[PDB]
């Protein structure tokens, strides 16, 4: 009622006051002395040309060589990036897939989409074929992002405005995170695999502690739908790319907006964002059919990745940081170095 | 220069590519239809003859039609509506008896405006089904059409009101050139409805073929 509305009013007022008090000067003033990275060499080393339809998600294995890609033709394709060979081809029960994951151990993969079911496939079997290890259900909306914590614990983001930490051995939601008011369209796991950020459709991102489950911090400032989130390699920050043609950097300590990567030239939103191994370069896939890589410190366009006919949908960087890979809406993935 | 194991891996990759190509050829001959309604407009009634998304497969005249009923997807439509960009047609169903509902036809018109005038469906045809024609007759025999339609000059006659509703739903389209709207006063009747869809689908396909020939 009215008094609860008023305490919420004063609580967010004092939160904003503390945020502004903890702000003295933008880090653009602290970073202008650093020599800019300049124009970045970018070439198409390999071109994975196996898909036959729209490509919606991808992920890099921890070996930095095998990558799994998901397309609307209902096929999960696991490629050896070094030789562009197709290690595996998995038929999906539901052809509508928008998320994909690769287990840290490499034994399992995850997939999901409009079926509201997260399917976990076992990659290493004595039968010599991939099989659907376990289907997880309980999400009332479409699955947008799923990430592996280990061989047995997964965390999934759905369109039901809630996230869920599951248990593949048993198949029930071990924990449920319900703090959002819109579709949660992305997910990122911190390096320690204890905290994770989720950017939803209410133009806000939220930080959750997977150990027990509750929204530790809420970050706002976006003017439209948030389509991608990605942790900083240090783990004390993250970057969110949204539909308003802006990428934004937040930290888990100051809990404030840091940088607004945007330009008057581009107006299309962001589909995927990922950092580099050192975190100096921040890549962002756009609807303008090209991926812009920005200096994470200078807020300047370090380079342009223009080799895709259609809109870039998924983007990933290998664990060793040796190369990046973009899967656009055309049937081709591309590897850049 | 590749070793024996690398050669065998390349052979396996080639076999996987062949299987992918065969599956793509098999799927490319399947016609996809995106079904949309209003929950009670009669999607079940249209699908009766042949927790997330629902898929229905049916064969007619050696043609495999796949219909994707989104149904209970209670999320943001614009977030996943681009997944269906490329379907052959959009089967939009609506009940004519809903003019004494909720106002419900106003919501149906709003949904039709949103779907038809969407950047993704700039070239996909819309097949409009108007069901509950008998219920429409029963309601119009007692309830005047002007209840939901203040700007209507006509009598309580089925043909006139039905034609007015069809014309007004049709003119909600903005790209009258590159996209066509097909309408059919569906009923229980027989497989005629399916026949209609087939004809419309063939139409779309013909145009698509002429687009591949660049001569359209």
């Amino acid at each position: 009622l009215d008094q609860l509305r008023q305490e919420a009013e004063q609580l967010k007022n004092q939160i904003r006051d503390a945020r502004k008090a903890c702000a003295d000067a933008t880090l653009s003033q602290i970073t202008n002395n650093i020599d800019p990275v300049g124009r970045i060499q970018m070439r198409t080393r390999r071109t994975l040309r196996g898909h036959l339809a729209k490509i919606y998600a991808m992920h890099w294995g921890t070996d930095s060589r095998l990558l799994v890609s998901a397309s609307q033709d209902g096929k999960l394709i696991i490629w050896d990036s070094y030789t562009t060979n197709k290690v595996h081809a998995i038929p999906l029960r539901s052809s509508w897939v928008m998320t994909c994951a690769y287990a840290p151990s490499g034994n399992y993969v995850a997939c999901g989409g409009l079926d509201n079911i997260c399917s976990i496939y076992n990659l290493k079997t004595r039968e010599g074929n991939v099989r659907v290890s376990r289907e997880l259900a309980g999400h009332t909306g479409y699955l947008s992002c799923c990430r592996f914590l280990d061989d047995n614990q997964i965390v999934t983001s759905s369109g039901d405005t809630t996230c869920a930490l599951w248990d593949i051995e048993t198949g029930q939601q071990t924990t449920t995170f319900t703090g959002h008011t819109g579709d949660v369209m992305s997910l990122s796991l911190a390096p320690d695999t204890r905290l994770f950020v989720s950017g939803a459709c209410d133009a806000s991102a939220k930080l959750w502690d997977v150990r027990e489950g509750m929204c530790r911090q809420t970050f706002t400032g976006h003017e439209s739908d948030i389509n991608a989130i990605c942790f900083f390699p240090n783990g004390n920050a993250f970057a969110t790319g949204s539909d308003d043609a802006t990428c934004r950097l937040f930290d888990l300590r100051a809990d404030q907006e840091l940088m607004t990567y945007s330009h008057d030239n581009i107006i299309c939103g962001i589909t995927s964002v990922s950092f580099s191994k050192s975190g100096r370069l921040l890549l962002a896939g756009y609807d303008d059919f090209n991926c812009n890589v920005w200096d994470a410190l200078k807020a300047d366009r370090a380079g342009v990745l223009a080799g895709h006919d259609n809109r870039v949908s998924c983007l990933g960087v290998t664990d060793d940081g040796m190369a990046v890979a973009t899967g656009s809406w055309d049937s081709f993935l591309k590897i850049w170095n | 220069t590749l070793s024996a194991e690398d050669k065998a891996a390349v052979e396996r990759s080639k076999m996987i590519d062949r299987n992918l190509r065969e599956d793509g050829e098999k799927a490319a001959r399947e016609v996809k239809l995106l079904l949309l309604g209003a929950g009670e407009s009669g999607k079940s009634t249209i699908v009766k003859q042949m927790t997330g998304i629902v898929e229905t497969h049916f064969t007619f005249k050696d043609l495999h039609f796949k219909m994707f009923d989104v149904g209970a997807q209670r999320s943001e439509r614009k977030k996943w509506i681009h997944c269906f960009e490329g379907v052959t047609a959009i089967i939009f169903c609506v009940a004519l008896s809903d003019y004494d509902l909720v106002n419900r036809m106003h919501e149906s018109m709003k949904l039709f405006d949103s779907i038809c005038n969407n950047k993704w469906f700039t070239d996909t045809s819309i097949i409009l089904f108007l069901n509950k024609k008998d219920l429409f007759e029963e309601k119009i025999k007692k309830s005047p059409l002007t209840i939901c339609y203040p700007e209507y000059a006509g009598s309580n006659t089925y043909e006139e009101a039905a034609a007015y509703i069809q014309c007004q739903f049709e003119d909600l389209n903005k790209r009258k050139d590159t996209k066509e709207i097909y309408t059919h006063f569906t009923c229980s009747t027989d497989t005629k409805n399916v026949q209609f869809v087939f004809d419309a689908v063939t139409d779309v396909i013909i145009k698509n073929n002429l687009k591949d020939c660049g001569l359209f």
Partner: single-chain antibody, 233 residues
Amino acid sequence: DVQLVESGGGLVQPGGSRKLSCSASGFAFSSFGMHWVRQAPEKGLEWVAYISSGSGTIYYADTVKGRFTISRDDPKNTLFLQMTSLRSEDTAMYYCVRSIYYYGSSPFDFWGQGTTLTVSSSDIVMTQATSSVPVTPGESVSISCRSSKSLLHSNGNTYLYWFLQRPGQSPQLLIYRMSNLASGVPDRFSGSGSGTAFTLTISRLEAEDVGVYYCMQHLEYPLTFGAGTKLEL
């Protein structure tokens, strides 16, 4: 589970036209390359033939090239070996080894039960040096194996495997690519080395390690096995 049943044995008068069959039950046999490997009684293993998945690539040993035929029947999960013009040295145990080739795979992981065939009356040379070393439980011995050509490839992986033949049953895979330890095998077996010199230690060796240990090359066809190392006591 995975099961390979081999049949078509017995005694054949020399120069016959017999046949060997191998039924598979428990895995996707259509996507597995299959190897036929013989073993003369008091000798070491020797690769006879191999046929890839999809029957697109077929290889034979030089000793039996033009005399043996290999084929697959995927719908009924069977592997056929046409025998032609048999001679005395063809008398051997026979195995229907399976192998799947992709990045990180473990070829030669499972072995068939074996079938007897008794007939009346540029290759890499792989040497295992010593053939019989006496051991006691609780020890640790470095079995060594030597090749002529350097098995290390430009890719960076040394295509070499070692297997164990325990008394009274089929051989089993111990280590693939000289480093990666195969599934089911305990961590006690560990192998390493370099080009043309490969070693392994059985950390805390005990019983059920008795048998003949074979080192095998896989750089290119034909594949040559070692003489085998006999472990006793």
